[PDB]
Design a binder for this molecule. Structure first.
Ligand SMILES: CCCn1cnc2c1c(=O)[nH]c(=O)n2C
Ligand SMILES: CCCn1cnc2c1c(=O)[nH]c(=O)n2C
Lengths: 108, 107
């Protein structure tokens, strides 16, 4: 438990989990359910908000930046895999701007 | 602000001389790099040289305002290039440096 992991839990993760564009990221990418067969060929390190929150809630992270990186690989997985015109990409951009805003006022 | 100076003098410093930074020091010239559809795909181009001229003319109004530019830069790269391209790895390496350097930004 660090002041940054605490800020990532109660400020960042609280803002992003309840957001109206959060629902595609609240759980891992189910490639058979979403009809995306190539996904785990293109995206070798999947990541999603449900995993990040359990880890914050479970003391999994040690230095916050590791949690910041899990957020970042989540967003980039979406930009890398999906078409540029896909609504999902715009939803990833909107959640990300918020993440960046909130980390901009983070301590230590 | 001090945040804009930290982003100019610690954050932009550490990414600019990186060995993977050269594709991002100056705007994408679509015709030289062999990417003609670039501007159909990328509606808001961005590059560290633009963020740099803006950092030293006090263009930015907040730290986040400038961190957004950095983010658009990395995101154009992921969106435009094929997942297998070496520039995708370069952006991720540069981007992870930015996030750790931003984490320890004052206030
Ligand atoms: C709204 C599109 C369905 N969907 C849900 N989750 C997704 C996707 C997708 O097409 N691409 C993705 O990357 N993820 C995480
Ligand atoms: C290293 C590949 C050529 N190249 C140089 N700069 C680039 C690219 C590219 O393929 N895609 C880009 O986005 N930029 C900025």
């Amino acid at each position: 438990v660090t002041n940054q992991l605490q800020y990532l839990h109660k400020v960042v993760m609280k803002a992003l989990w309840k957001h109206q564009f959060a629902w595609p990221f609240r759980q891992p990418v189910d490639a058979v359910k979403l009809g995306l067969p190539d996904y785990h060929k293109i995206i070798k390190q999947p990541m999603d908000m449900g995993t990040i929150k359990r880890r914050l809630e479970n003391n999994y992270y040690w230095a916050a930046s590791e949690c910041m990186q899990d957020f970042n690989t989540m967003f980039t997985n979406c930009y890398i895999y999906n078409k540029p015109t896909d609504d999902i990409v715009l939803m990833a951009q909107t959640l990300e701007k918020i993440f960046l805003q909130k980390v901009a006022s983070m301590p230590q």
